Amino acid sequence: TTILVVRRNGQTVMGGDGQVTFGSTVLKGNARKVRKLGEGKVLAGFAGSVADAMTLFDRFEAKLREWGGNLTKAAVELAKDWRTDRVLRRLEALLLVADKENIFIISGNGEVIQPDDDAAAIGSGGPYALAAAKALLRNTDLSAREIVEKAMTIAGEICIYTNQNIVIEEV
Amino acid sequence: TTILVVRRNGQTVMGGDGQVTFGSTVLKGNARKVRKLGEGKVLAGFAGSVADAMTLFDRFEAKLREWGGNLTKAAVELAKDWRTDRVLRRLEALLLVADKENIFIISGNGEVIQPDDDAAAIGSGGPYALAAAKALLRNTDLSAREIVEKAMTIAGEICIYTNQNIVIEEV
Amino acid sequence: TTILVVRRNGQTVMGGDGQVTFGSTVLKGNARKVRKLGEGKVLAGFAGSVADAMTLFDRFEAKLREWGGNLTKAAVELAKDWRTDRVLRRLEALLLVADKENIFIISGNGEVIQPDDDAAAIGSGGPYALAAAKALLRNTDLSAREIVEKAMTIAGEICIYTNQNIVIEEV
Amino acid sequence: TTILVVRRNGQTVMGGDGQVTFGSTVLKGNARKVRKLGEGKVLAGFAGSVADAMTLFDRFEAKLREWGGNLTKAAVELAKDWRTDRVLRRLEALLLVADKENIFIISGNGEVIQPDDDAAAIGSGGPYALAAAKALLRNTDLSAREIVEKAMTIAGEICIYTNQNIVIEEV
Amino acid sequence: TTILVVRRNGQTVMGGDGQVTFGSTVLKGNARKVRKLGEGKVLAGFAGSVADAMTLFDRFEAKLREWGGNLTKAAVELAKDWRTDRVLRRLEALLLVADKENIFIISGNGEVIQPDDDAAAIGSGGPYALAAAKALLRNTDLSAREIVEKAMTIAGEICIYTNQNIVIEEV
Amino acid sequence: TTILVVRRNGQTVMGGDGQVTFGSTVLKGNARKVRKLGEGKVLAGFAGSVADAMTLFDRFEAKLREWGGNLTKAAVELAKDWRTDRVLRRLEALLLVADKENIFIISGNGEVIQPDDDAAAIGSGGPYALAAAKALLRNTDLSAREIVEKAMTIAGEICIYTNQNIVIEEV
Amino acid sequence: TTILVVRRNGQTVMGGDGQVTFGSTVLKGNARKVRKLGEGKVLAGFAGSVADAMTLFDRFEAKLREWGGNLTKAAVELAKDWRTDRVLRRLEALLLVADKENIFIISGNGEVIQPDDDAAAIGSGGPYALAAAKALLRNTDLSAREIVEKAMTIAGEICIYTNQNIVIEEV
Amino acid sequence: TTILVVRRNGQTVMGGDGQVTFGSTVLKGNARKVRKLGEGKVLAGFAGSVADAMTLFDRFEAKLREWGGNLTKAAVELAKDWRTDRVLRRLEALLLVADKENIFIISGNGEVIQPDDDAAAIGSGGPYALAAAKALLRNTDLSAREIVEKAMTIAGEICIYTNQNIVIEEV
Amino acid sequence: TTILVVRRNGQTVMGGDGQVTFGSTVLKGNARKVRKLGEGKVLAGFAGSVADAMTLFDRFEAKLREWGGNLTKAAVELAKDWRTDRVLRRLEALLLVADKENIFIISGNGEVIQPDDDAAAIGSGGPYALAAAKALLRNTDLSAREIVEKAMTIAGEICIYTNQNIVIEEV
Amino acid sequence: TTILVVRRNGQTVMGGDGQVTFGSTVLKGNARKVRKLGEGKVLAGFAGSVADAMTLFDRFEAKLREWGGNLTKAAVELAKDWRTDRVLRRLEALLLVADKENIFIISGNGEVIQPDDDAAAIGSGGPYALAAAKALLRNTDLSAREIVEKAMTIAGEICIYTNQNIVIEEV
Amino acid sequence: TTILVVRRNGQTVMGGDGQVTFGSTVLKGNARKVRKLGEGKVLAGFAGSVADAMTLFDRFEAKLREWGGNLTKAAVELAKDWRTDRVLRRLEALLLVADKENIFIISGNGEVIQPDDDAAAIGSGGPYALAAAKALLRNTDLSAREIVEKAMTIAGEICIYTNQNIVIEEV
Ligand code: NA
Ligand code: NA
Ligand code: NA
Ligand code: NA
Ligand code: NA
Ligand code: NA
Ligand code: NA
Ligand code: NA
Ligand code: NA
Ligand code: NA
Ligand code: NA
Questions:
Q1: Is CB count within 10 Å lower at the N or C end of chain A?
Q2: Superfamily of domain D1-171
Q3: How many angstroms separate the CA atoms of H59 and H74, rounded?
């Protein structure tokens, strides 16, 4: 799995591959690992099972409403719940969320991390797409969308756990 | 074990073998691992114990009624419960359900997977039945029922955990 | 431990050895691992501790009453309870039950297995007794009672966890 | 640790060594691992910590009262509780109890075992004392008390986890 | 795999199945695991690879010639070599050899075992074929060949690693 | 990796994918894992390193010369050398060879296996290609060449260690 | 396995059971684990495979000849060889040897141990037979031979790895 | 560690970071992991200890001389030696070599791999530098040298086992 | 991560690096791991997730209020709550707090440690910063602020989990 | 095992216990683990097998001759031989030697250690005897002989691997 | 253990502690872990056994003479031998050598590391001594000898495996 988000020219674009692997066999190749939350204002990507992510996204949606759409506050509060709530604590997944100004990686270990760069990624192929994205951001004038398509494509080329069927969303 | 579902010409067929294994010994060769749910409109197969399957199918039936027969919604909600409910959380069977338009693999790990092809399978011999089904779907005009019959026979021939006693249900 | 059930010409016989092992030492050699339940119409054997067996058999007795002596129904409902009930879930014995027409292996993992043959067995020595039983069933005209005695003896001869002190019950 | 009980000439005698080991160092050499329960009518020995045994003995005392002093019934009921009660289930120890007519080994796994002989033993050195006791019972006319002293002494000689400071009680 | 030898009425017969398994898949179903050595006077079967078996049988043939056809001596000497020789020490197959009077199980661990019964077996399904053979030998007047045929069929039915394609040799 | 051989109506075809994986990253996607040996009469494929394969194929070539093109003899002698030779013993590739009449899987564990069917395969994706191949062989009139191409494609689609860049050789 | 030696009234008697176990199945029940060496003057027992013991006994025989029949010296020199010789060092077994005046336990770790008592034993059931032997030696006037028969019999009763078919030799 | 090689416009450039890590501490930050062989015509990079690499490079130099400067042949022959030579087989490292027309990754497992692209990399940070290099090669007109500097720099940013002190060589 | 506190001549300074590591990749390099609590009189740093830290610091703030700014009392009560509270028990961050007179390391294992020196540190790089800090405290006249900056730099230079982006707070 | 050496006022005394343990059973209680070497001028004790000790002591004797009784030189050269010699390298005993002026602990790992105090010890119980010895050396006027006896007794009292049967040698 | 080398003003100084630890007990506190080689022109320290160190230093001395005192060449060649030579390959000490211009850490894993700073260290406490040395070198004008003295004291204070008894050598 590879989820990548890139911000450039006031646009934030997030992409995700579509491969679902069980052991060493591909069960599905067109998975949609990127969704939209907060009334189409927040991008949300996930590395993990659908049900786990959905339950977490539900709690995240709630947090967004409760704290007036404050992404930073919502992310921290979700991390807290995910960490202590007996239910969510059993969920295994890694999240990547972002609006037009902030990006956060959130984990079940109480982590809320905003990389100090215009790009971030998670999943087994995350670092590959990220390296590519950082390269394109610093040496081309390509748009956020194009960088994501190209970086994700390169990640799929290298990682056996990530494919080339990329789904892209934007806010 | 091998459970295979094939969709063709608006018809959906599911087949399952009958072998039950404990360690290295075959305990039973005529198990029924396939049933019909949702008033005969849904096919359901399982890799696992009878009690686990029944407990899960009962919750699935409820999900179907609650969400107006929406297989996609019902599968997702069942997966969420399987992950949170302390009772279901102990059940370890692997499920395969389908109707005329969709197919879903559901696991106790919150996984809800719909392969992007007209065939899907679970169990130790699943991939063999699947490879055979794909080959037949793409190179013959055989019906969904004919393909399931022929694919299951091959899986039972290759996998030591799958036999040739097949039960078939159709919708 | 070896528990064996053989049915031949309307007669159903169950035999169990008496060896109780702790680590690598025999603590008792005359244990009774077989009994009659449901007003003398059901044969019940177990591979495990006596307290576990007693609690499970009591629940089985209740199921038999609630479902009007239906062995199949009773066995399935016991397995579902065994799998969901907070108390029973701690019980780890392996059970083998039979009446004049059906035979079921029941486990704490939700298993309810009826072998598709006229003999069934559980315990470390089960497979050996089963092999001997099938050989006699298919190549001699010996009665179920004789077969069980002879098969159990051979199992105790081969398995270090099974002895030759056999208890037999018939229905 | 070694706990041994021997019955001979209407007398039941139980002995236990006094060694308490932590890692490879002896912390105490005069431990009292044998107590009297049921108003001085039942002998009770234990391999394990004092607190664990005490809590179990308390529950055993209760069971004895509840079932009219029936040792067999009391032992089975304790085994059941020890197995399922969330509290006792956390206790780690092995028990050896006996009155003037019955002897039972009881474990946290629901086991209630009465050896088919006039002797029984538990603990790391149990089998050594037992072998000795069986030898003396079958080849001498020594009293139960003397057999216990000699057998325990031999166990202490052989096992590094059992010493020669023997405490003996009788009913 | 299952290799069974039965001695009866001065006649010795050895049978072997034909299944070859890699992981969970059957690679071949008609393997020949039984041969004749020592000028047609010795039966030899193996659980393991062809190259290993052949290398071992060649050394065994030499041992037979050297010790004047003494199966007992030849088996012991082969076992010693298998244990010391750096070349043979790498071979891991399990062997079963027999003539009109003796039977020996030989392993690379210096084991040379002659069971004290007129039947012996090796391989994953050996004990099942053995239990069946013992039952038939003690309850029928069937020949060594008939018993091997019937016992092997049963072993192949129970063991997922043994099939029904049997090769039989006799001396 | 997937190497597949299919024989139909006198034509023998071998196909192999081109993916080279190190850990979880693809290092090359156009590898040649199939070649012709013995003056163009023998098909040879391998799952492993190229240096291992070259050394083994060279020894195989020698065996073919020494035994006058006898594939069976050559395969067996190669396996014996592979198992005993101090040099070859360090080689861990898995081989698959075939001529116009025979097919053999050869391993460093002394295995020499000829499947009893008109198709054989090795490598992580072998079973999938095999299942697809058998399905097409038994339910279509497609040639060996077409079957291999189609089966290899399906194997690369399912297995994350096998890609779709196929090399084919025929005899 | 259980090997026991007892000295009393100028007579040294050594006994051994006959059970040979592979996993949890008895392959042979009349094994002869006690031999005579040094021209019928030295008793030699072994826990381990036949070939290993034989090779060690051969080297022991040699040592006895070399050092003029000095059992003590022969045992020490064998221990040295067993420890350093590349061949013997691969042998896995435990030995128990004795003449009319000395008893020694010898291991592949360079151990040569003479217990300070008139009895010694090795094997899984060794301590059980030893405890019994010590009991009979100190409380009866039974002969060495009878003590061995009774102690071994008791060991077979307790240990699942030792049986009641005892072979006895004397010097 | 990260070693990257890029070919563009008839120029082949190889770079390597300078970090040497022991546990979780940096012992050196200006390591030179890239050398020149074959009379300054071949680039050679290594992930592993200095001595191991040096010994391998020595053998590689020899192979280059022996086969007339044929990089492909030299690499294969080194792989063979590294695989079987008792000395080299003990060496633990991964190599990356290249001239102006070919690039090869060589391992101690007999692997000789030429990626099908104008870039290749090894070491823990290899895939990160590679992803970046592939991005720059396909979307900019930067020289091989600049791509290497930028890609390596990005790898150092991401991987904790790779730093920013890059050594670059060219042929 | 490295968090360091140094006190010299009434001045207490705390510094923390900014590297956030997931596995072996740096996700962020400018994290703020140090803050001021208790109305600007308490320095607080942490090695762990931000959500864990926030929850713990909030509880610490409460303790400070309840115990009238008594750092010792507050630290001890926080540790007791951390150890017993069902919520906090899931929090695994390591804390370091200090005011103008005391310094305490607090963990989820009930630890409350005040080093007996004028410097303290936590995190993977703590010991390195501590060593450097003590060296400067004892052999120079540098202020606490200068020492922290210099020590933190050296820690980031040696530890792969600590970087050079330092945040400093003083009281 | 415990071996202790104490030197006080020109007198050097070495004591060793006599317990020999195999697993968790005492096989002998009167072993001699201490001897005199170098014409009665060197005290030598060991924790290990007797064969290992004898071979090592013989080599030590040779070193003492070759280096003119220089204990330091002899101990170092023995350690170097122990570490490089193909034979000695298989020996795993731990040695303790001393003369009227020096004391050395020698191991197969090349260790040559002379404690900087007037007492030294090896074996599982060494530290206990050492603690007791130092206490008596520093707070009483007891002789070396008395101290060793008293310290060894206390060590045997605390350690389950050390008994109270002490052998003493003096120089 | 802690061995530290510091170069300053053309003077090179190496210091080492004297603690020797076995398990959790200090066996000696005045060990000499630092020596002078190459006619007093080279400093050599070690973390490991005396025999190992001496054997390695002897080979190092030879390397120095052979390569005309070239420390860099000698270190590399020693590392190669340590890796190939069957005798040295068993030595496991860690080495630290230096002269007026260079410093090298040498390991049995073929590692030859020269840190890019005027200080280096090995052993459990190395990093602490190193952090202290770097701090002093960059913030004072203290000599190499003064810094080593002060840094070693600090390392001994922090590490439980390093003490305050330091030996210092200079060149
Ligand atoms: Na991919
Ligand atoms: Na099958
Ligand atoms: Na038995
Ligand atoms: Na004892
Ligand atoms: Na089968
Ligand atoms: Na693929
Ligand atoms: Na027994
Ligand atoms: Na880095
Ligand atoms: Na760092
Ligand atoms: Na003791
Ligand atoms: Na210290």
A1: C
A2: Aminohydrolase, N-terminal nucleophile (Ntn) domain (3.60.20.10)
A3: 10
